[PDB]
């Protein structure tokens, strides 16, 4: 009854960062080695916990949030960061405990003519709270006149599409990101190591 981390990391399709996906992992035995002994990853940043010891530990739940961003924004998926992704799309708390794993997916998420299916939120009335997901598609009102649901003067589309082209520089290429959060409640622990 291994934990279904394969269906998270090896998922054929990933979500947009504004609509980031969450998979709850529970009642499972996990082998985190397969993750931290892999050579397929570009970023593997852990916070408040050692992955090398995750197989000796137990947890109530593990949340696996996955999405796609561009390379130069992977730095934003960390506690205490700012910018469009951290403010408007996916925000980590200061007391984050878990790991942030990313790898270049240019061969999968870019295509000739551009892949415009991956979007991120460009405007918002306020910064997101930790782990808040906003899938609003309302025209952003930047001025005094209501927008009446259409784009116009001082009223902008809230979401912006990534221009993923195979010729993009590496910092503008798509990167698939998986954020593992480890939850310990005053309850039985159901995600454990071998």
């Amino acid at each position: 009854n291994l934990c279904p981390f394969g269906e998270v990391f090896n998922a054929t399709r990933f979500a947009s960062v504004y609509a980031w996906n969450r998979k709850r992992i529970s009642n499972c035995v996990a082998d985190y080695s397969v993750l931290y002994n892999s050579a397929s990853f570009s970023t593997f940043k852990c916070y408040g916990v050692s992955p090398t010891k995750l197989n000796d530990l137990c947890f109530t739940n593990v949340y696996a949030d996955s999405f796609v961003i561009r390379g130069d924004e992977v730095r934003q998926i960390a506690p205490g960061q700012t910018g469009k992704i951290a403010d408007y799309n996916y925000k980590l708390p200061d007391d984050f405990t878990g790991c942030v794993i990313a790898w270049n997916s240019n061969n999968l998420d870019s295509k000739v003519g551009g892949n415009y299916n991956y979007l991120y939120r460009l405007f918002r009335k306020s910064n997101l709270k930790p782990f808040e997901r906003d899938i609003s598609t309302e025209i952003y009102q930047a001025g005094s006149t209501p927008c009446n649901g259409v784009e116009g003067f001082n009223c902008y589309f809230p979401l912006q599409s990534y221009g993923f082209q195979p010729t993009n520089g590496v910092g503008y290429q798509p990167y698939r990101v998986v954020v593992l959060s480890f939850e310990l409640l005053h309850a039985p622990a159901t995600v454990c190591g071998p």
Epitope: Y36, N37, A39, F41, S42, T43, F44, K45, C46, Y47, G48, V49, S50, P51, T52, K53, V74, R75, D95, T97, C99, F182, L184
Partner: antibody, heavy 119, light 114 residues
Framework: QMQLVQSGTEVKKPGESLKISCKGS????????IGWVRQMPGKGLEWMGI????????RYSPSFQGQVTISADKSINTAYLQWSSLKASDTAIYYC????????????WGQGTTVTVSS | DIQLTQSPDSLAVSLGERATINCKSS????????????LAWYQQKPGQPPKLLIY???TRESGVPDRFSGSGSGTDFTLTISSLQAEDVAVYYC?????????FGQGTKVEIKR
């Protein structure tokens, strides 16, 4: 499973630059943050700073910020500690230590680089 | 910055006897997320790099003899060497990794009493 190897002994003159290294080998190096610890002769350990080689995210302690530069070449799994102009007070042993993640203990240590700056 | 202080500075105890080292924290290093104290104990022998003995205040690193025990919480921690051996003559450091910048205790020297 992970090992850190540091460059050899250094004997320099005051005012000279210096760059010492610490190379990692083994499985799981992608998760490791490399910190630098100073130990002056007969004294204790002083945490100078830390770097994640994957994106060169660097954190310094306020007592060493601006005095040294910590960097990394991820293509060769190497971290670097450098001075632009050495002082006699820089004479010490410098350890590179490794921890798989921020807010984690230093479970892997290098053998140490002895640095002597003297007239 | 979190300040750590150790006590005593020097310790001499006979073969097979007990050795106690106290680490005081100027600030709590307990994360209520996973309910763990982010405190580690290292041992350094002459001419040797430091070696991690205990992490999370009370968890022994793999290959560390049971005679090394970590205890405590909040701002008060203790390393206890039940039955001191000749191999254990060394300087011991507590360190907090709750938040950067990481800080060390000043170190406690442990020698054989004769």
């Amino acid at each position: 499973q992970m090992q850190l190897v540091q460059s050899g002994t250094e004997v320099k003159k005051p005012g000279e630059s210096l760059k010492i290294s610490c190379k990692g080998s083994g499985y799981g190096f992608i998760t490791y943050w490399i910190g630098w610890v100073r130990q002056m002769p007969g004294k204790g350990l002083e945490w100078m700073g830390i770097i994640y080689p994957g994106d060169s995210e660097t954190r310094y302690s306020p007592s060493f910020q601006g005095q040294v530069t910590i960097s990394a070449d991820k293509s060769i799994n190497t971290a670097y500690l450098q001075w632009s102009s050495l002082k006699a007070s820089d004479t010490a042993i410098y350890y590179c230590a490794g921890g798989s993640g921020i807010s984690t203990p230093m479970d892997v240590w290098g053998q140490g680089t002895t640095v002597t700056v003297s007239s | 910055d979190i300040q750590l202080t150790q006590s005593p500075d020097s310790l001499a105890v006979s073969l097979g006897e007990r050795a106690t080292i106290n680490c005081k924290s100027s600030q709590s290093v307990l994360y209520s997320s996973i309910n763990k104290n982010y405190l580690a104990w290292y041992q350094q022998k002459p001419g040797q790099p430091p070696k991690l003995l205990i992490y999370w205040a009370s968890t022994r690193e793999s290959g560390v003899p049971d005679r090394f025990s970590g205890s405590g919480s909040g701002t008060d921690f203790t390393l206890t060497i039940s039955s001191l051996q000749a191999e254990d003559v060394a300087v011991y450091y507590c360190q907090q990794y709750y938040s950067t910048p990481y800080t060390f205790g000043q170190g406690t020297k442990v020698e054989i009493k004769r």
